[PDB]
Amino acid sequence: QSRQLFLFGDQTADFVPKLRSLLSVQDSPILAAFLDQSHYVVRAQMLQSMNTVDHKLARTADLRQMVQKYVDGKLTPAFRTALVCLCQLGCFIREYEESGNMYPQPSDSYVLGFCMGSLAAVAVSCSRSLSELLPIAVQTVLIAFRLGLCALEMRDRVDGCSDDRGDPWSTIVWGLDPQQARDQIEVFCRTTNVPQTRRPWISCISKNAITLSGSPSTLRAFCAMPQMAQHRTAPIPICLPAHNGALFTQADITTILDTTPTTPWEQLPGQIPYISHVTGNVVQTSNYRDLIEVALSETLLEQVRLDLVETGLPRLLQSRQVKSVTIVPFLTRMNETMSNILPDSFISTETRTDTGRAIPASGRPGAGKCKLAIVSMSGRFPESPTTESFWDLLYKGLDVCKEVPRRRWDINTHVDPSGKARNKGATKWGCWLDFSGDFDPRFFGISPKEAPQMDPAQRMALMSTYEAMERAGLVPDTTPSTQRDRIGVFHGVTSNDWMETNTAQNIDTYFITGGNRGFIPGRINFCFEFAGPSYTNDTACSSSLAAIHLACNSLWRGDCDTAVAGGTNMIYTPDGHTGLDKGFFLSRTGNCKPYDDKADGYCRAEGVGTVFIKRLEDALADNDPILGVILDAKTNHSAMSESMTRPHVGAQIDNMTAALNTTGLHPNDFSYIEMHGTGTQVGDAVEMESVLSVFAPSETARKADQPLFVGSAKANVGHGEGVSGVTSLIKVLMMMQHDTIPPHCGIKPGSKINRNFPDLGARNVHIAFEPKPWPRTHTPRRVLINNFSAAGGNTALIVEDAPERHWPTEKDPRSSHIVALSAHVGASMKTNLERLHQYLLKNPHTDLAQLSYTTTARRWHYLHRVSVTGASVEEVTRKLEMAIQNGDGVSRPKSKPKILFAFTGQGSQYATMGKQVYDAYPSFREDLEKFDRLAQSHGFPSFLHVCTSPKGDVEEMAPVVVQLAITCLQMALTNLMTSFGIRPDVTVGHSLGEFAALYAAGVLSASDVVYLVGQRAELLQERCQRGTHAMLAVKATPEALSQWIQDHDCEVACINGPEDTVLSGTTKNVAEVQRAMTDNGIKCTLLKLPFAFHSAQVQPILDDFEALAQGATFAKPQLLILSPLLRTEIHEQGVVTPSYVAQHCRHTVDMAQALRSAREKGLIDDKTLVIELGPKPLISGMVKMTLGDKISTLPTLAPNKAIWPSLQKILTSVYTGGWDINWKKYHAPFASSQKVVDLPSYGWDLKDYYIP
Amino acid sequence: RDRVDGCSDDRGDPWSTIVWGLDPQQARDQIEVFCRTTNVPQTRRPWISCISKNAITLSGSPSTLRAFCAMPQMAQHRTAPIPICLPAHNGALFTQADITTILDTTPTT
């Protein structure tokens, strides 16, 4: 039968690319565990067996840093053995963890390893599943690291002068017989007098070649001599001894297997047969420890005989498969090489190779090992009250360095000699925000008296946070990630001006409480009701970026699902100017002016900045507008510096390298570096060499046609000293938005770069002087952000490009759309209306469905409200203009109108009933099909064909089907209105709609309504006779008809209004009454019916129907029920019983009296919404005639009409009344429109709360 | 469960019980007679969920199920309640359409 061969290679392989592949896999738990544990064990072992100087150079915290330091020549040759074994085992683990294949088994597998590739073979052969292989593989990696240390020691014991001579200890010589090579070695060593320990030896004996190992000096002298010139040679870059039984001994292996006891040697027996690379035979079955010892003996004590392997492997299978069915192909699984040899030696029989990754996808990577999506942003910057103005200022390369105005403080009042007194300034520059006093306290539930005592930074942070929340379409408690208890606030602030100390004009009890320093995030938590973790950070000049790091850490740990990371910097008290302007740290000139031969300092600036961060999975599920993705945050300290102030090049290099190692990206994947650009003459020099060392190390470096640009927002707005990190992140996100690298304003056109950067261009590192196109392509654009502080802390943030998801374009079936606006006052209502109107005029091509989705489902709805419906953006624009002109929302609302559900009788049936809602909302369709199945399980025929098929009207339809169709349609409509959030306050049904009213009131369950209606209809069909009675609609008061009814034996069926009554009786009596009152001028309508309820025709079924109704459960009403039978209200448990339901079908429907009594009792006023549920509005006329024209009746369905005008009028009226709609369920079945449109920001009702 | 007993949001009482020493056919006949005599709607009838060899399990709405057991001709049998409060194992209440709705958000190519 077929078998599989697993092959493992030696150290000669190229493992760095493959190992880099393993470190990037994402949905493999065992592989991640294997990498973590292998690094842990090697980290433990390398302290014991390394000297102090060599350990400090090679010390690593993670496997990615180990792989980095290996390629930099900071490790030793001992690490190569460990890393190659680790790569082989990780490759096996990934191959079998991604395909989901059955683990290799003893009876269908073989394992073979070459020249230290046998350790992984032993580990794999001693396992039954991938769970048992994890600890064994970690132990094997430890043993492989110990094998490398033993060979390094022997290398130094033979050639102590070869600490630098890591030259090839081996070479390949072609066309040389082993015996001739042996004799030549002997003669050369005898003639040249070489010590016995330096003699060459043959490591490997292949068929067309042999490998010669030895000390580089003697080996090269032996090869570089006559009698070997004919042979072609190739050095092998390995620099360790091996395969020499004259140098190693069993006692060397015993030292390797020292820290590896397992209580039973057979704790791990062997399963898969094992083949030796020095014999070509199957090794006798043993346990793990006895097989590792064999592997090390073969590696260090014996010659690797590849010719014997090639001869014996074919014979091994031939002796086995011959006893089996037949010799069949061989799957060959490889890790480094030696496949290509096997199919050639095998083409005599059997061979194949492998590949695969075919298990179902999973849930996205967890809280860790996952990217963080920035979904919105906001802030305030100098001369930029928005992020749009900030970009417009970046684009042209403006600097806004400016002196203090009289608004904050007048320098002329400070005119005085050298400031040796208190509160004496020494510098005059500074970039303040003119718009600092503006606030809207009422939006945040704050008294206008309390507002002046608040810290301005706090108020601007509040408004910016709301703006960022608006820009992401984030509504708390609407998605799993936006539950109020899963939202944290992470603020970074270092200097608080006039927040806790200065105030003297006014003091109250609520002065220090509420604003100490922890009340910025605390007040954000309280005002927005965020009940997750809350922190503040002081890292002075990297407070905001370190706070973003803390927020990312909380998101990676799982402490929150959404993070609000920001920062503020205020200079309201200019006292800080004096302190810094003593060591020349501050500047007596303009803006920061980053790296150049002109730098003299930096200018302080104020600002605010907010970003909302989620995990990428949560933002993808919420349909949020991702701005960018965070890949890694890193922080360290430049503690090993001459002073805290002095920056250290090594520390910054280490931080940037750590970020790069974590992300797994090459330095050539980065197109922009956002530098800290402190502005000091020497400060920027250190950062530039750090950047070049990390990113553009040399000329002709990997930079060939991929330029790197550098710059900093400190050139445009100054040094934020706490908002620098958020400012830089916001700048970088707005570069991806506009696909443009802004010009750099640090260097004047007539100036020159600093002489310490002589050949920036030669390295392919440029500084934009004009806006540069930065197009968005299929390859994401990566940016590195840097932040430093004079406290010594360094933060580095790597930001990627957001992906392109699908945005499923598809036409929306709706013909019109609703656009909703709201505000907490009238001024804001007018402002928001004007802003949306201007926006739509400026962008006439916007999507209307997505506009509706954004305005309704992705917004919070305040007191004042407005709605508009249009078929296109132009119609909506006209209607918005009319709303602006007429007011429409500027006046306070009131009274929250009551909602009455009215259910129509049985004269409203028609084919294709409610088919438009059935085709619009899957929930309605599911409910209707559920009710049809429920009726079928009750013993009644299916009625669903009434509401879908257009064939057949009354010919093939019995009363049961049409009555059940009407009733179940009304119940489904009730469920649909309940989903949208519409809760009735009272119910009323006419004749057959009474049951739906009871269902809506909570009295009956769905089965009890179906049961009662169907049983009543079946009794009617069975007992009564069709066509005996008739109904007569008469335009006369029921009192005036007493004589005509008391003489012709008729009866009053329904009293539908003050002058509308329906009479019932036999056909002869009905005709006689019609003739009699026709001659009197009365207008009558004759209705022919097969069965006449509320007449004498239903007497026989009364007793039977009352007995059946005993089985139904009548519960306590949950809401008022208007009873046309009792002509009063029902609000107790015992009123509705089987006796009530029996009388209802026989006595008169006094709809007029029920409505009149409800009006008198004050239960329904004229300003209440009467939502008419049913196939056709008939109680609307009753309500209009009985109560008046001042009551609004809202139909649902109609025979030949579109639902959307009617459905949207209900939602609009309820929404404008003051009630809350479940807008997410109104938009749910239309995925095309579920995209957030970038609309204007909130129309803040701003006022100047400036304190003198 | 809510479609049959909307007044059983609080009545999460045992929708099932175990009755020992009752033949399935005798239980079926007694259920039929009780339902015919007491005029119970077709959706509230008891049904046998499980048929072991020594016992059977009777499922139904708690109100009708307890009234059926709490009557003569079943006093002899020892009964215990199963604290489960959901319907199941009833082809007269569920249908292939319910299963199709269940397997909605589960396509594999």
Chain A residues within 8 A of B44 when measuring between CB atoms: 1007, 1111
Beta bridge partners, A1145, equal none
State the Cα–Cα distance between residues A383 and A998, nearest whole angstrom: 64
Structure tokens at A221: 């002298």
Give, in degrees to the nearest 5, the angle at Cα A554 between A552 and A560. Answer: 115
Q: At what angle do helices A1006-1023 and A959-979 cross, to 10 degrees?
A: 160
> A352-353 and A330-333 as β-strands: parallel, antiparallel, unpaired?
parallel
Name the nearest CA neighbour of A181 among A157, A143, A209, A156.
A209
**Three-state DSSP class for residue A274:** strand
Query: Mutate which of A926, A931, A933, A1103 to test chain B, going by most B C-beta atoms within 10 A?
Result: A933
State the Cα–Cα distance between residues A1097 and B43, nearest whole angstrom: 30
φ, ψ of residue A796 to 5 degrees: the values are -135, 130
Report CA A780 to chain centroid distance, whole Å.
18
State the Cα–Cα distance between residues A550 and A536, nearest whole angstrom: 10
Long-range contacts at A341-347 (CB < 8 A, ≥ 24 apart): A341/A310, A342/A5, A342/A7, A342/A313, A345/A310, A345/A313, A345/A314, A346/A314
Residue A308 identity: L
Chain B residues within 8 A of A1112 when measuring between CB atoms: 41
**Three-state DSSP class for residue A873:** helix
φ, ψ of residue A118 to 5 degrees: the values are -80, -20
Instruction: Tell me the CA distances in angstroms from A790 to A542, A606, A609, one per residue in order.
Output: 9, 18, 22
State the Cα–Cα distance between residues A205 and A212, nearest whole angstrom: 9
Name the nearest CA neighbour of A1250 among A414, A407, A606.
A407
Structure tokens at A73: 């020549």
Structure tokens at A962: 């049409």
Chain length of chain A: 1252
State the Cα–Cα distance between residues A429 and A419, nearest whole angstrom: 17
Quick count: other Cβ atoms within 10 Å of Cβ A938?
17
Hey, which residues of A are catalytic here?
541, 676, 719, 991
Strands (E), A252-382: 274-275, 330-333, 352-353, 372-380
- Structural element, H or E, at residue A633: strand A628-637
Q: List strands edge to edge, sheet with A1084-1087.
A: A1051-1057, A1060-1066, A1029-1034, A1084-1087
State the Cα–Cα distance between residues A610 and A588, nearest whole angstrom: 31
Chain B residues within 8 A of A1141 when measuring between CB atoms: none
Q: How was this model experimentally determined?
A: cryo-EM
Write out the residues of chain A at the interface with chain B, using a CB-CB cutoff of 8 A: 360, 926, 929-930, 933-934, 937-939, 1002, 1004-1008, 1011, 1107-1108, 1110-1113, 1115
String of b and e for A486-514 (b: at least 16 CB within 10 Å)? bbbbbbbbbbbbbbeeebeeeeeeeeeee
Structure tokens at A740: 């443009």
3-state secondary structure labels for all residues of A746-808 = CCCCCCCCCCCCCCCHHHCEECCCCCEECCCCCCCCEEEEEEECCCCEEEEEEEECCCCCCCC
How far A1010 CA lies from chain B's nearest CA (Å)?
Answer: 10
CB A635 within 8 A of CB A549: yes
Beta bridge partners, A773, equal A740
Chain B residues within 8 A of A1011 when measuring between CB atoms: 41-43
State the Cα–Cα distance between residues A143 and A153, nearest whole angstrom: 15
Chain A residues within 8 A of B39 when measuring between CB atoms: 1107-1108, 1110-1111
State the Cα–Cα distance between residues A236 and A67, nearest whole angstrom: 22
Name the nearest CA neighbour of A26 among A617, A420, A552, A540.
A617
φ, ψ of residue A932 to 5 degrees: the values are -65, -45
State the Cα–Cα distance between residues A454 and A446, nearest whole angstrom: 10
> A109-113 and A233-236 as β-strands: parallel, antiparallel, unpaired?
unpaired
- The reply to whether residue A937 touches residue B42, judged by beta carbons under 8 angstroms, is yes
According to DSSP, residue A1232 is labeled G
State the Cα–Cα distance between residues A320 and A82, nearest whole angstrom: 35
Give, in degrees to the nearest 5, the angle at Cα A726 between A723 and A727. Answer: 75
**Three-state DSSP class for residue A429:** strand
State the Cα–Cα distance between residues A185 and B15, nearest whole angstrom: 92
Q: At what angle do helices A288-301 and A118-125 cross, to 10 degrees?
A: 170
CB A487 within 8 A of CB A476: yes
State the Cα–Cα distance between residues A211 and A304, nearest whole angstrom: 10
State the Cα–Cα distance between residues A521 and A477, nearest whole angstrom: 20
How far B80 CA lies from chain A's nearest CA (Å)?
Answer: 26
Quick count: other Cβ atoms within 10 Å of Cβ A690?
24
Write out the residues of chain B at the interface with chain A, using a CB-CB cutoff of 8 A: 2-7, 38-44, 63, 92-93, 95, 97, 101, 108
Beta bridge partners, A505, equal none
Taking one residue from A and the other from B, the number of pairs with CB-CB distance under 8 angstroms is: 50
Annotated resolution, angstroms: 2.6
How far A968 CA lies from chain B's nearest CA (Å)?
Answer: 13
Report CA A71 to chain centroid distance, whole Å.
35
Strands (E), A54-153: 109-113
- The reply to whether residue B44 touches residue A939, judged by beta carbons under 8 angstroms, is no
For A1014, nearest residue in chain B (alpha carbons): B41
Quick count: other Cβ atoms within 10 Å of Cβ A198?
15
Give, in degrees to the nearest 5, the angle at Cα A313 between A311 and A314. Answer: 75
According to DSSP, residue A206 is labeled -
Chain B residues within 8 A of A1108 when measuring between CB atoms: 39
Quick count: other Cβ atoms within 10 Å of Cβ A145?
23
- The reply to whether residue A937 touches residue B97, judged by beta carbons under 8 angstroms, is no
CB A105 within 8 A of CB A272: yes
- Structural element, H or E, at residue A157: helix A130-158
State the Cα–Cα distance between residues A430 and A589, nearest whole angstrom: 10
- The reply to whether residue B3 touches residue A930, judged by beta carbons under 8 angstroms, is yes
Name the nearest CA neighbour of A854 among A1151, A624, A551, A1087.
A624
How far B98 CA lies from chain A's nearest CA (Å)?
Answer: 9
φ, ψ of residue A784 to 5 degrees: the values are -115, 130
Residue linked to tokens 């709607």: B41
**Three-state DSSP class for residue A3:** strand
Report CA A976 to chain centroid distance, whole Å.
30
CB A541 within 8 A of CB A627: no
According to DSSP, residue A605 is labeled B
Structure tokens at A1120: 């008022």
State the Cα–Cα distance between residues A603 and A427, nearest whole angstrom: 10
**Partner residue opposite A1007 with nearest CB, options B38, B43, B92:** B43
State the Cα–Cα distance between residues A39 and A63, nearest whole angstrom: 6
**Partner residue opposite B39 with nearest CB, options A930, A1006, A1108:** A1108
- Structural element, H or E, at residue A612: strand A607-615
State the Cα–Cα distance between residues A980 and A973, nearest whole angstrom: 11
Name the nearest CA neighbour of A979 among A1060, A922, A1020.
A922
Structure tokens at A412: 């002329």
**Three-state DSSP class for residue A119:** helix
